Amino acid sequence: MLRDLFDRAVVLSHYIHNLSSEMFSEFDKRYTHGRGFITKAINSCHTSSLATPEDKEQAQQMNQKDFLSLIVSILRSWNEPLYHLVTEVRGMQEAPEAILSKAVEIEEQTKRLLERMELIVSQVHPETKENEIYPVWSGLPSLQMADEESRLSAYYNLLHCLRRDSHKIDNYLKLLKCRIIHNNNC
């Protein structure tokens, strides 16, 4: 039953984006406010190499099956950095409690969203290609660096990229909900 899955997918996605957003802010206000970290954030996202729609018209031009697989690849691709984000932060001596609680919730909710999406794929395209080809993140040594300025900016990009991708996923789900269930008459 599509309508219940989508509703729940979009509740999760919007919640995840909201948390990524507040996490990035809180990290910024209390670690990077004073510096040019934003200028170092440019082009730094492990998913940028995927072919993603950048506007409503590209979104519309995109085959539905491919669009869904795209959301799946993006989410699969974030399992790994979210895991190390939580691990690294939790392992700190005096770890920022508001930042850590978001990261943990995002980590858990991302998994659940991926299940709802998997359920959606196998309902809407039941004879699908069963092939992972998501982009690899391999930024763990930079989170682990001892040069504190370099560390803070690896983190900054990670949170900056998480805020973007969580937004994007959320928006793409809304497009697909409207197209699949409502023929674009939401």
Partner 1 sequence: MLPPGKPEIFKCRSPNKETFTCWWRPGTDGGLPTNYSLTYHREGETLMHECPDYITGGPNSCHFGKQYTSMWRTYIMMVNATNQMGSSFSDELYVDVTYIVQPDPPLELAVEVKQPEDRKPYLWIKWSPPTLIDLKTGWFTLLYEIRLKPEKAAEWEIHFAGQQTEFKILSLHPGQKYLVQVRCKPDAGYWSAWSPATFIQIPSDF
Cα–Cα distances in Å, from 7 out to 117, 164, 173? Answer: 11, 21, 10
Rounded least distance, CB 181 to Na ion, Å: 25
# residues contacting Na ion (CB under 5 A): 1
Toward partner 1, which CB reaches closer, 34 or 126? Answer: 34
**75-89 burial: b if 16+ Cβ within 10 Å, else e:** bbbbebbbeebbebb
Task: Mark residues 165-184: x for contact with Na ion by CB under 5 A, - for none.
Answer: --------------------
Toward partner 1, which CB reaches closer, 48 or 87? Answer: 48
Among 33, 34, 51, 55, binds partner 1 (CB under 8 A): 55
Residue 81, helix vs strand vs coil = helix
Contacts of 88 (CB under 8 A, 6+ apart): 143, 144
Give contact residues for partner 1 (rule: CB under 8 A): 14, 17-18, 21, 38-39, 41-43, 48, 52, 54-56, 59-60, 164, 167-168, 170-171, 174-179, 184-186
